[PDB]
């Protein structure tokens, strides 16, 4: 992992977002519910 002073950004696009694994394994969502991410679409992540 990158240092906090030099945080690293990875782009996610053109894919199917399966969030079950993240639930399966701190998890706070703002403006969105963690149990409804399975049925949303985004222009970028």
């Amino acid at each position: 992992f990158a240092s906090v002073y030099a945080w690293n950004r990875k782009r996610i696009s053109n894919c199917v977002a399966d969030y079950s694994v993240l639930y399966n394994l701190t998890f706070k969502c703002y403006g969105v519910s963690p149990t409804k991410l399975n049925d949303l679409c985004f222009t970028n992540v």
Binding site: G31, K36, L40
Partner: protein
């Protein structure tokens, strides 16, 4: 015919009745786009993005604002109706006496 034809304002008294009611309905529709502090004016996404108890809060704002709009519309219609009733009564009097 010449007096009426060449004077667009001659029938303003009747055109205003049409315009006032048409505007009232268009205003009532436009108010739907207002959020009243809510995150969205669209109920369906508020349900899709937020959880149950969270969506309920955002919706209560929208319901309250929209109930306030409908009540305003009706109040103004009652006031306008009173004015038109008086005019109709005058017209009926003139029909009898003139």
């Amino acid at each position: 015919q010449d007096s009426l034809s060449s004077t667009p304002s001659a029938l303003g008294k009747l055109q205003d009745v049409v315009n006032h009611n048409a505007q009232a309905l268009n205003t009532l529709v436009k108010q739907l786009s207002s959020k009243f502090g809510a995150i969205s004016s669209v109920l369906n996404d508020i349900f899709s993005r937020l959880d149950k108890p969270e969506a309920e809060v955002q919706i209560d704002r929208l319901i309250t604002g929209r109930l306030q709009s409908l009540q305003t519309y009706v109040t103004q219609q009652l006031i306008r109706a009173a004015e038109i009733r008086a005019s109709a009564n005058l017209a009926a009097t003139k029909m009898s006496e003139c």
